[PDB]
Write a protein that binds this ligand. Structure first.
Ligand SMILES: OC[C@@H]1O[C@H](O[C@]2(CO[C@]3(CO[C@]4(CO[C@]5(CO)O[C@H](CO)[C@@H](O)[C@@H]5O)O[C@H](CO)[C@@H](O)[C@@H]4O)O[C@H](CO)[C@@H](O)[C@@H]3O)O[C@H](CO)[C@H](O)[C@H]2O)[C@H](O)[C@H](O)[C@@H]1O
Ligand SMILES: [Ca+2]
Ligand SMILES: [Ca+2]
Length: 491
C-alpha cells in the first residue's frame, strides 16, 4: 500500500510531490501511496548523505547517478540488479525494449546486470538530434535593426556588432543599459563554448569529440581552443562582457533577459530567457578569421541510464516493479515527462482528446516552457518513442521548432560524422577516470576564466598542458579511445 521514495524536483514545484495533479491521479490508478523525501536543491549531495548514513528509502526516483556511483552502489549492495524484475513483472517496459532493442544494451553493465531504469526520449537522430547543440547563441535583432547593422557572418563581424551595442546605445545611454555579451560560465545550456568551433574543432561539456579519422580528441588542449579563449579575452578587453558573467545565476540571467538587456547570449530556448517575441533570433554559425566554420557536436542524446534505482532495503520488490512499469505506459510516460491536462487552478501543458484517448499540446501563450514544465512534470523513468507522435501524443511545439532550427542553421556545419557513444565502462576504468576528473574538470574551467580575466594565456599555455598530463590526460584519453574502439567493434 505504501512505498518510500527519495526524489528530485524543481524548487518551483510543491514541497510535497503528492500535490502534483499527475501524482494524485497516479495514486488512484495504482492504489499505491508514495511517501516522498523530496530534495529540491543540491539533490546529489543530500542523496549521498542519506546513503552514507544508512538512511535508505525503498527506491531513489529521478536519480540521475553517474556510472561510477551506480557501480559502486551495486558492488556494495546498496542497490540491486533488476533484470529479473523486468522480465517477470514489467510488460510496458518489455514492449519498449522489443520495439527498440538497442536500449537493452544501453541498460546493461559490463557484468551483465541491469541496475537502473532509464529515461528515453526520441527527438531527432544523429546530427539532427535535438541534443546536438545545447548552448545555442541568440542575438537581439531589434538592436541590429535600430542601429542599421546586418547579421554577423564572421567572428570579426560579431566583434563590430557587439561594439556597436556598447558604443551605439540601442537601449539607452546608462552605464548598465546594454549588456553586449552574456553567458553563465561552465557546463550547460548558458555557456559560451558553442563559439569555440569558429576557430575549428570547438568544445563541448565533455571536452571530447571524435575525429573523422576515428581518433578521440580532447578539445581543451587544442591550439584551436587557445584561439577560442583569446577571442573571448578580446571581448572582455573591449568592455563587452556582462560584468557579472562569472558570478550570476539563472534567476538573475532570466531577469536581465526579461528586460531584454542582452545583445548576444546563450540558452537552450530563448523563450525561457528573453520571452516569446521576435526581438531575438538564432545567431547563424559564424566563420572565423581563417574561414573555419563548424558546429562541434555534443555527446548528448535522448537517453539517461538511471532515472530510478531500487535499494537493498526494499521489501516489496514486486509492488515496486509494477509501480515502475506503470510509468512506462505511453500516456503516463508522456505526462511524467512534460506535464498534464485538466487542472482548473493552473495552466495546462496538454488537453486530453477523449475520442482518440490521446494528448495534444496546448499553446503556451507566452508562458516560459521550462517554467510550467517544472511545476507539473514528474521526471523519473519513462519512455517516449518517435512512433508515439501522432498516435499517443503530439510532438511538443517547442521541440519541433528547435529541431527545425538545428536542421536549418547547424546540421550543414556539423562535419564530424561521429560523436562519442554512451558506453558503460568497467568499475576499474570508471574509478580511474573519476580520479583523473576530480583534478581535471574544475581546473579546465578555472584556467579558462582566469585567462579571460587576466590575458596571460600565451605565457601559461604550455605549463597548463603539462599540468593536464600530470593529472593523467594521456591515460584518460587512452581509456576513452579504448571504449570508442570497442563500441565500434561491438564488447
Ligand atoms: O542538472 C540538474 C538536472 O538536469 C537534468 O535535466 C535537465 C533538463 O530538464 C529539463 C529539460 O527541459 C528542456 C529540454 O527538454 C527537451 C530535451 O530533452 O527539449 C525539448 C524542448 O526544446 C523538449 O521537448 C524536450 O523534452 O530544457 C529547457 C530548459 O533548459 C526547457 O525549456 C526544455 O523543456 O529542464 C527543465 C528545467 O530544469 C526541466 O523542466 C526539464 O525536465 O538538464 C539540464 C541541465 O543541464 C536541466 O537543468 C535539467 O533539468 C535532470 O532531468 C534533472 O531534473 C535536473 O535538472
Ligand atoms: Ca553604451
Ligand atoms: Ca586535443
Amino acid at each position: 500500500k505504501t512505498l518510500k521514495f527519495m526524489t528530485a524536483s524543481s524548487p518551483l514545484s510543491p514541497k510535497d510531490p503528492n500535490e502534483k495533479l499527475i501524482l494524485q491521479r497516479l495514486e488512484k490508478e495504482t492504489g499505491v501511496h508514495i511517501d516522498w523525501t523530496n530534495y529540491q536543491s543540491d539533490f546529489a549531495e543530500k542523496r549521498n548523505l542519506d546513503i552514507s548514513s544508512g538512511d535508505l528509502p525503498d527506491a531513489i526516483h529521478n536519480d540521475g547517478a553517474s556510472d561510477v556511483d551506480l557501480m559502486n552502489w551495486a558492488k556494495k549492495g546498496v542497490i540491486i540488479p533488476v533484470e529479473d524484475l523486468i522480465d517477470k513483472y514489467m510488460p510496458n517496459l518489455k514492449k519498449i525494449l522489443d520495439e527498440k532493442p538497442e536500449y537493452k544494451a544501453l541498460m546493461t553493465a559490463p557484468d551483465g546486470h541491469i541496475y537502473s531504469f532509464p529515461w528515453i526520449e526520441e527527438l531527432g537522430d544523429g546530427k539532427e538530434s535535438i541534443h546536438s547543440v545545447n548552448d545555442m547563441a541568440w542575438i537581439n535583432k531589434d538592436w541590429l535593426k535600430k542601429l542599421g547593422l546586418e547579421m554577423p557572418k564572421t567572428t570579426d563581424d560579431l566583434i563590430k556588432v557587439l561594439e556597436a551595442f556598447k558604443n551605439g546605445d540601442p537601449n539607452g545611454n546608462g552605464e548598465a543599459a546594454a549588456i553586449p555579451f552574456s553567458f553563465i560560465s561552465g557546463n550547460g545550456n548558458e555557456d559560451f563554448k558553442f563559439l569555440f568551433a569558429a576557430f575549428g574543432i570547438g568544445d563541448n561539456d565533455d571536452h571530447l569529440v571524435v575525429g573523422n579519422d576515428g581518433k578521440v580528441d580532447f578539445t581543451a588542449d587544442n591550439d584551436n581552443y587557445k584561439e577560442g579563449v583569446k577571442f573571448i579575452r578580446q571581448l572582455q578587453e573591449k568592455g563587452l562582457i556582462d560584468k557579472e558573467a562569472f558570478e550570476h545565476d539563472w534567476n538573475s540571467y532570466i531577469a536581465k533577459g526579461h528586460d531584454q538587456k542582452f545583445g548576444v547570449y546563450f540558452t537552450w530556448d530563448k523563450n525561457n530567457v528573453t520571452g516569446s517575441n521576435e526581438s531575438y533570433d538564432v545567431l547563424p554559425v559564424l566563420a572565423g578569421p581563417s574561414g573555419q566554420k563548424h558546429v562541434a557536436r555534443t555527446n548528448g542524446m535522448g537517453f539517461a541510464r538511471d532515472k530510478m534505482v531500487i535499494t537493498s532495503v526494499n521489501k516489496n520488490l514486486e509492488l515496486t516493479a509494477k509501480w515502475i512499469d506503470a510509468q512506462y505506459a505511453p500516456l503516463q510516460s508522456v505526462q511524467n515527462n512534460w506535464g498534464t491536462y485538466g487542472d482548473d487552478k493552473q495552466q495546462n501543458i496538454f488537453e486530453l482528446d477523449q475520442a482518440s484517448n490521446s494528448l495534444k499540446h496546448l499553446p503556451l501563450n507566452g508562458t516560459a516552457p521550462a517554467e510550467l514544465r517544472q511545476k507539473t512534470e514528474v521526471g523519473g523513468p519513462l519512455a517516449i518513442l518517435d512512433s508515439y507522435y501522432g498516435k499517443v501524443t503530439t510532438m511538443p511545439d517547442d521541440a519541433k521548432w528547435r529541431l527545425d532550427l538545428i536542421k536549418e542553421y547547424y546540421v550543414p556545419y556539423m562535419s564530424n560524422v561521429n560523436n562519442y557513444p554512451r558506453v558503460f565502462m568497467t568499475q576499474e576504468d570508471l574509478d580511474k577516470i573519476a580520479h583523473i576528473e576530480a583534478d581535471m574538470n574544475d581546473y579546465i574551467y578555472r584556467k579558462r576564466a582566469e585567462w579571460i580575466v587576466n590575458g596571460n594565456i600565451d605565457t601559461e599555455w604550455d605549463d597548463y598542458k603539462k599540468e593536464l598530463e600530470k593529472y593523467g590526460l594521456s591515460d584518460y584519453l587512452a581509456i576513452k579511445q579504448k571504449y570508442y574502439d570497442q563500441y565500434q567493434a561491438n564488447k
